């Protein structure tokens, strides 16, 4: 400060300006990133590799700002993304939008608590009236449509057109195997992206899909006792002496054969422990391969940790470098453990089917990684939006036909509840228009034009914005029934969530 002491970068103006303004910075694109999104975002992640998406959290985590303002709220956006797969595209914009009313009320001179608390009780009032606007509930996981109907909404809230083949393909991955009652799992259903085939060739093989080359034979048994190992081959040939191969002419003789019998004992000890599939994040060797061909134990030549991880995760396997006779601790899990060609890529396939614990493994055949990973992104955040763990998701208008109802609900009521809080309560019903704007953003019209008509749709729950021109000229697309609703819950959090950090990040002048 004035004094050489007082560590801080936040406060006073730079709070009522820069913090909120820095909060404004990132919500800018989240607008283009939520609901139907025609917008796209190049990102290099410190691979210098471009990637394209509409999602903030993928990007924001990378982005580094002086100020915890940005650094905090993402956690809530994560806290959403943790609990709810999508809407996080939205979860940031409303707070940042709702915030900047304060700095205005600060120019209008409204106190911290005064500005805060109006949003609060209105947020409770929201949390009171928000479930009143539950317009449906989900029903059946076994039904593909009942699932896929919703799933578009989040895929929509990532990317618009693709959602159709996708949402179906998702419940066709059997979101249904899990009850979605107190349980559901990504890693069991895990996306596995095959570069090649088509992007709409993205398929479903229930049970593990490992793009890794499937070696040896097929597993000794399909129940396979599965000993997965980080690097069970560090080489059994040693790299030593002169040439980084040999030094003395007598050296080479012992280098070549030693790999064999060690790996022979190693792959015998794979059979000795009884592993019916051998998984080497370490190298593949033809002898060991032929040993794995002799002992008939299916071989995995190379592993991402994700391989080992999931194998460690799902099978109950434990990946360990073995220069060491393998010992089954990993043991088995999956009742059918296969070789397969999916995308006609050699696909390491383990499968076991259980109401909980079943791997129903999303296999994305795809033409482009940079797409198929963003194609993964929406289905990810779509099935994570499928993750509610209420089979009946108490659905509310998806793509936000809600806000117009609530923008009507609160600020009207907002004045009824009196005192300067009312203005914060009335400011509360404003930033609803964000996604109606944020779609009209990527749709290309004015939120006023939107809201004026979508106030003129009055009590609806249905008509609202979207993509194309029906979010433009009428600003009317049925966001109850385009087939698009959203769960009350993912909605319920964003208000609740974006209530907290927004309220919070204002309070802090240091």
């Amino acid at each position: 400060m004035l004094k050489e002491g007082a560590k801080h970068f936040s406060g006073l103006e730079e709070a009522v300006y820069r913090n909120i303004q820095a909060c404004k910075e990132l919500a800018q694109t989240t607008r283009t990133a939520y609901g139907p999104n025609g917008m796209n975002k190049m990102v290099i992640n410190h691979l210098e590799k471009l990637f394209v998406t509409n999602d903030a959290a993928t990007i924001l985590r990378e982005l580094e700002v002086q100020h915890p303002a940005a650094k905090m709220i993402v956690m809530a956006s994560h806290m959403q993304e943790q609990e709810v797969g999508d809407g996080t595209n939205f979860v940031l914009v409303f707070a940042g939008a709702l915030l900047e009313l304060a700095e205005e009320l600060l120019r209008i001179g409204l106190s911290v608590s005064e500005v805060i608390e109006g949003y609060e009780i209105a947020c409770r009032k929201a949390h009171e009236i928000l479930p009143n606007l539950v317009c449906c509930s989900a029903k059946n996981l076994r039904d593909i449509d009942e699932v896929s109907s919703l799933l578009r909404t989040s895929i929509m809230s990532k990317q618009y057109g693709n959602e159709v083949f996708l949402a179906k393909l998702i419940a066709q991955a059997c979101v249904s195997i899990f009850p979605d009652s107190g349980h559901f799992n990504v890693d069991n259903i895990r996306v596995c992206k095959i570069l090649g085939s088509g992007i709409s060739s993205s398929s479903v093989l229930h049970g593990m899909v490992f793009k890794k080359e499937t070696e040896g034979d097929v597993t000794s048994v399909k129940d396979a006792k599965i000993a997965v190992y980080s690097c069970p081959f560090d080489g059994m040939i040693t790299e030593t002496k002169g040439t980084v191969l040999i030094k003395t002419a007598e050296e080479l003789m012992n280098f070549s054969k030693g790999e064999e019998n060690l790996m022979d004992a190693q792959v015998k000890a794979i059979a000795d422990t009884g592993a019916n599939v051998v998984v080497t994040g370490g190298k593949v060797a033809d002898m060991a391969l032929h040993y794995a061909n002799k002992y008939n134990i299916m071989l995995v030549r190379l592993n991402s940790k994700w391989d080992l991880r999931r194998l460690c995760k799902t099978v109950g396997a434990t990946a360990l470098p073995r220069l060491t006779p393998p010992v089954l601790e990993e043991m088995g899990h999956c009742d059918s453990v296969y070789l397969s060609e999916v995308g006609d890529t050699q696909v390491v396939v383990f499968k076991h089917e259980k109401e909980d614990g079943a791997i129903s493994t999303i296999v994305l055949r795809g033409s482009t990684d940079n797409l198929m990973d963003d194609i993964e992104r929406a289905v990810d955040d779509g099935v994570n939006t499928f993750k509610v763990l209420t089979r009946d998701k108490r659905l509310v208008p998806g793509g936000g036909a809600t806000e117009i109802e609530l923008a009507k609900q609160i600020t009207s009521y907002g004045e009824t509840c009196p005192g300067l809080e009312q203005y914060a309560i009335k400011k509360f019903a404003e930033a609803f228009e964000a996604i109606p704007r944020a779609l009209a953003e990527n749709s290309g019209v004015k939120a006023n034009e939107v809201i004026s008509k979508l106030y003129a749709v009055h009590q609806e729950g249905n008509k609202n914005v979207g993509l194309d021109i029906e979010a433009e000229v009428p600003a009317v697309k049925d966001m109850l029934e385009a087939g698009i609703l959203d769960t009350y819950l993912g909605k319920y959090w964003a208000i609740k969530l974006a209530t907290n950090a927004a309220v919070t990040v204002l309070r802090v002048d240091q």
Partner: protein
């Protein structure tokens, strides 16, 4: 840890897109400049296409790298079409940049593009002209014209039809690739321009003339083809070894021995199968004796491509070890003859057990003339093979472009608004191709393209520019002939990157 957003950034994306596009611009027509590319190499690199320098090119706009990928895509996919995909994006990016200030910025952008590139692929397929074997032609007579087409492109003799019907043959032989590789032309420096031979098996431009090479047979009707990736020379067992002397036979012994291990290793694969011994690498003057001392032909310092051609055509397996002894790491032609062709000591391999590599002999020893024909033949091959691969064909020189432009801006009238402003500018995308050619063909991009618009408002069959004839007319009956699929594929990538990158003014980077 970076980022960027907004039209200030957005136009900047477009800003780079226009820059490179002028490199692929006339690179088809060989009139212009070219930039010799020295890199940290320090060496000359000179292109017929931007794709060469695109591989060389490293971008500050990774947005520019995007179009690269998709310009590389249809290019590498077709063997050509960088110039296509490149100009297509940059066009609208040029076109929309003034719109950008109005904004096309609402993502209504692509909704134009899709439908834009949509009407055409339909319009293109109906304007795509399919062909068959005996249909209008002999299917050689087809490719006769299709090779005549690109051989009539840039001036050579009546060698056009001479080269045309010929090169059609090994095409009709090995056509699987769109590529000319399996057929790849051998330039021969020597002979006559009337001397050219499309060879149905791998033919080696050169092997070196050794000591005993004169004694090595130039004729095998059963070549057992050793494909050697290493040297077999006097230094395999070095010929200088010092010896202690209490007497003079100590020298005799040390010399007469170290000479043998040379013969020893090489005779192993010889005794096994090898009459034709092919090293891509030097052969020592003493070892080529041991090669000839057997009188089983050796060829050292031979083309790797031919060496790889052989593995393709002759069924041989490339050998990195003479100490590797076998007949299937050999290969069987039923023709090894070596007749020096011009000055090159020249190996003939045909009678390959399959012969999946052919090569066209081009002679006359005229460097200027022939290499230009060789570029001419590539396009003939580029046409004729893909003219097969897509038998639906279509006329070049923007033959449908003014029509499409018309046909497209025909649909413009109804919209008017942001996407019509595209549909017209989307129509305007088509004239840029003859536009640059109007430079090359000696024309007025101002005057001519409208004439072709007029001649697509008067004609409208194929009427378009001929850089070849330096005129304008129906290009299909100006015989300028390319498949419509590449043009379909041009469309697919055209709007694609176009609609793609314009969806990003919001850009993120994280060098951190």
């Amino acid at each position: 840890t970076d980022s960027s957003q907004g039209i200030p950034q957005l136009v900047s994306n477009i800003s780079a897109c226009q820059v490179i596009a002028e490199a692929v611009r006339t690179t088809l027509g060989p009139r212009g400049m070219d930039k010799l590319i020295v890199d940290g190499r320090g060496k000359a690199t000179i292109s017929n296409d931007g794709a060469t320098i695109l591989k060389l090119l490293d971008v500050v706009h990774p947005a520019a790298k995007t179009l690269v990928d998709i310009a590389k895509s249809q290019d590498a996919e077709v063997g050509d079409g960088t110039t296509s995909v490149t100009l297509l994006a940059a066009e609208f990016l040029k076109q929309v940049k003034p719109y950008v200030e109005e904004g096309l910025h609402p993502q209504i952008i692509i909704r134009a593009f899709r439908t834009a590139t949509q009407l055409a692929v339909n319009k293109i397929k109906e304007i795509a002209v399919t062909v068959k074997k005996a249909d209008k032609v002999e299917q050689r007579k087809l490719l006769e014209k299709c090779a005549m087409t690109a051989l009539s492109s840039k001036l050579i003799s009546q060698q056009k039809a001479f080269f045309a019907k010929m090169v059609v043959d090994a095409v009709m032989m090995l056509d699987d690739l769109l590529q000319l590789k399996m057929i790849g032309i051998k330039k021969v420096q020597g002979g006559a321009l009337e001397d050219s031979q499309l060879v149905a098996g791998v033919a080696f431009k050169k092997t070196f003339s050794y000591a005993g090479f004169e004694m090595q047979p130039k004729k095998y009707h059963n070549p057992k083809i050793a494909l050697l990736n290493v040297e077999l020379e006097l230094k395999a067992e070095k010929d200088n070894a010092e010896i202690r002397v209490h007497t003079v036979e100590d020298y005799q012994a040390i010399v007469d021995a170290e000479w043998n291990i040379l013969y020893d290793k090489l005779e192993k694969i010889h005794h096994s199968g090898a009459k034709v011994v092919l090293s891509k690498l030097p052969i020592g003057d003493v070892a080529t004796q041991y090669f000839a001392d057997r009188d089983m032909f050796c060829a050292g310092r031979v083309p790797e491509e031919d060496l790889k051609r052989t593995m393709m055509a002759c069924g041989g397996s490339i050998q990195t070890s003479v100490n590797a002894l076998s007949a299937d790491v050999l290969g069987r032609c039923q023709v090894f003859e070596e007749t020096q062709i011009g000055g090159e000591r020249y190996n003939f391999f045909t009678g390959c057990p399959k012969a999946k590599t052919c090569t066209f002999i081009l002679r006359g020893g005229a460097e200027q003339f022939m290499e230009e024909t060789e570029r001419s033949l590539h396009d003939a091959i580029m046409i004729v093979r893909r003219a097969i691969k897509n038998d639906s064909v279509v006329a070049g020189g923007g033959a449908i472009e003014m029509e499409l432009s018309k046909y497209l801006r025909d649909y413009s009238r109804t919209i008017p608004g942001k996407q019509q402003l595209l549909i017209g500018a989307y129509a305007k995308a088509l004239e840029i191709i003859p536009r640059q050619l109007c430079d090359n063909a000696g024309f007025d991009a101002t005057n001519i393209l409208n004439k072709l618009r007029a001649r697509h408002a008067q004609g409208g069959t194929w009427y378009g520019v001929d850089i070849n004839n330096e005129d304008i007319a129906d290009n299909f009956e100006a015989f300028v002939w390319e498949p419509a699929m590449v043009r379909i594929n041009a469309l697919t990538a055209a709007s694609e990157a176009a609609c793609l990158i314009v969806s990003v003014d919001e850009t993120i980077k994280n060098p951190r």
